[PDB]
Structure formats: C-alpha cells, structure tokens
Design a binder for this molecule. Structure first.
Ligand code: YT3
Ligand code: YT3
Length: 381
C-alpha cells in the first residue's frame, strides 16, 4: 500500500466549489505586470490567464520558421539521465535550460487517489541529456521553472499538451510560452491519427512499452522500467520536432505556412485555463431515465443523497469518485434501498473502504429515503 503523497504537502489542496485561483505569484518574462492581488504579499482581473497578454502577442522567431537541419537524437545509451528532487537541483536545471535553443517536456499524472488529479512527474529533454523531476517532492518549488517555460526565446516541444497545460497551472502555477505540439503538426501530415508511441516507430523505429499508461506514478522509488518508460517520452521529441518542420517545409513548397499554423494552434492550447469541475446527479438520473430504470420517489432520493454524500466525501478525503463509491454500486444501493447497514455492503463488489468506514452515515441516508412518501402511481406499481 502507498501512503498518500498529499499529506507531506505544505499547503493543503482546495477541493471546494470555490473558483480556481491561479497559484503563480511572481511572473518572469513579463510584458504585463502580474495582478497585485496575486503577489506573495497580498495573498486587472485576478482570475485571468497570467500569461494572457504575452501569449496573444507571441509569434515564433524567423530562426525557427526556416528549413530545419534535423539533429539526430543522442543514442539513449550514451545520454545521461538525471533524477531531480531538491530545489537546489531544480534551480541548477532551470539554469541550464535557460541556455537552450529548445527542450522537450512531458508529465505523468495520477487521478485514482485524488479528487482533481495530481501531477507526479515531469520529464524534460535537451539535445544531450534527459531529466526526471519528482513533482510531488518539489511540488511547491516547481514554479521556479516558469523562468524558462515562459521564455519566448526558447521553444518548448510537447505532444498533445492539452491536459499538460491544465495540470501545470493547476498544480504548480506554471505556464508555457512558445510551444510546438508535435501532435498538432501530425494533424497536418496525415498522422494526427496516431499517438507518440507510433510516431516513435515511424520516425525512430523505437518500440514502445504501454504497460505504464495507467500505472500508479505516485510510487516511490520509481523502478528502472518506469524511469525508462518516462524518459523515452521526451528523448526523441526534439528530433521529431525538426523532422516535422522539415516535412511541413517540403509541402508548403518552400514556405512556413504550415509551421506558423502549428505554432498558432499550439499557442492556443497554452492559453487554456484550468476550471475546477462540478458534477450533478441530474446527469445520471437522465441516463437512468432513458434506460427505463423507473426510480420511485424513494429510490431517486436515496440516489440523490448518495451522490451528495459521495461528492462531499471525495472532496474532504481528496479521493476520486471511483474510489469513494463507483456509480453502479451507488445506483444499486439507491435501488435496493437496504434496510440494514449490512444490506448496503452487499451491493458493493468489492466494498470501498470509505464506504465501510462511513457505513452508518450512509445508513441514515438510505433510512431517510425510505421514509419518503410514495406517489399514488408508485404504490400500486
Ligand atoms: Y510512450
Ligand atoms: Y439534483
């Protein structure tokens, strides 16, 4: 069993209906001052995208828009690998990155034992080295990387950064400026169809392991098989970045028409803001209504309170819905309207721990539901 990494976090995570307030408190590479309300002290819209201005006013430099001379990825077995877990080490890396023409980025996320989700690892590759950053440990010191991630001079290469852009700002208050999504280029080369794993074959004839796409990245220590799985996802990314600019150049008949599009599409992805979610029972009750489930006043109520009891527990304990109580079990309980606490436990296969732990709290809820007055049509029927 793994101990929840959120416990050692210095600042508790907010899982309240409150609207997400960007965590950035010092804005490097700024063109528009960062709202005073966000300064480290006071802790002109506050809920705006910190790098909104710089992003809208960004265009790739001529240097990159010109036909590339692909630089082969360094042989993986000759490429040094660095494990970063201390601020001092993170600060040294950021310093090296600041002297780069461009570098690759990718994150490992987790969501089963977390309400909103949690970023457990960050992978960065330069033309010659590979780095693995422990974003659990350095969670509160990650922001320092904003110096290079928002440096328009350096080009950050990702592959489908859609969610990565949202976890970076939601977890570390980090943002990106000057990004090239290889998945966006891929769409312009009839490849937007396949993943990076496939692009690693077509472009570098490298076999990919997919045993870890859903593994537990909160684990520590990270075994070699996982460290390798992770690095491989940023190591050959710069090469593919050059190769794709080369191919998009030999298509626009000697022009940066397509290149600018990728950069533009990518810049938009970077402009996405994170928004805390909200879930309502109305959604399910709508599906269960089409599946001719026919839930009576009592069942509907039992489901309504269970859905409510779950959202509350998931936010307090900082767990996912699927951990606290998966739908089908919730829906089952709502139907059976179990008279005893033990009756509830029967509907669960298996029985989630927070349910056994609150078995009584839940019992009182079902109980309440069973006291609800049935409509006439539901008594006879
Ligand atoms: Y992979
Ligand atoms: Y409702």
């Amino acid at each position: 069993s793994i101990i929840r990494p959120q416990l050692k976090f210095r600042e508790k995570i907010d899982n309240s209906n409150t609207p997400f307030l960007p965590k950035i408190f010092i804005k490097p590479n700024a063109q528009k001052p960062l709202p005073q309300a966000l300064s480290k002290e006071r802790r002109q819209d506050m809920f705006a995208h910190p790098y909104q201005y710089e992003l809208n006013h960004f265009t790739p430099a001529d240097a990159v828009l010109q036909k590339p001379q692909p630089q082969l990825y360094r042989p993986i077995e000759e490429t040094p690998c660095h494990f970063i877990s201390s601020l001092d080490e993170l600060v040294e890396l950021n310093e090296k990155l600041l002297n780069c023409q461009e570098f690759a980025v990718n994150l490992e996320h987790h969501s089963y034992r977390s309400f909103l989700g949690l970023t457990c690892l960050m992978q960065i590759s330069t033309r010659t080295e590979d780095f693995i950053i422990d974003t659990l440990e350095l969670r509160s010191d990650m922001y320092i990387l904003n110096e290079s991630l928002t440096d328009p001079a350096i080009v950050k290469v990702f592959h489908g950064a859609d969610s990565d852009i949202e976890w970076l700002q939601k977890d570390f208050g980090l943002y990106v400026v000057n990004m090239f999504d290889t998945h966006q280029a891929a769409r312009l080369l009839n490849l937007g169809r396949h993943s990076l794993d496939h692009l690693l074959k077509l472009y570098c004839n490298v076999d990919s392991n997919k045993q870890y796409q859903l593994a537990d990245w909160r684990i520590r220590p990270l075994p070699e098989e996982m460290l390798s799985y992770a690095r491989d996802d940023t190591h050959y990314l710069l090469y593919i970045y050059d190769k794709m600019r080369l191919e998009m150049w030999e298509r626009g008949n000697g022009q940066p028409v397509q290149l600018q599009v990728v950069w533009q599409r990518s810049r938009d992805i970077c402009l996405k803001k994170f928004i805390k979610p909200i879930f309502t029972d109305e959604s399910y009750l709508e599906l269960y209504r089409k599946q001719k489930k026919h839930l009576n006043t009592q069942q509907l109520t039992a489901f309504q309170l269970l859905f409510a009891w779950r959202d509350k527990t998931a936010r307090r304990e900082d767990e996912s819905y699927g951990y606290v109580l998966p739908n089908h079990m919730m829906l089952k309980i709502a139907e059976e309207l179990p008279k005893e606490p033990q009756g509830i436990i029967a509907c669960c296969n298996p029985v989630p721990p927070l349910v056994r732990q609150q078995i009584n709290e839940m019992h009182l809820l079902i109980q309440q539901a069973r006291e609800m007055p049935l409509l006439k049509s539901e008594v006879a029927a």
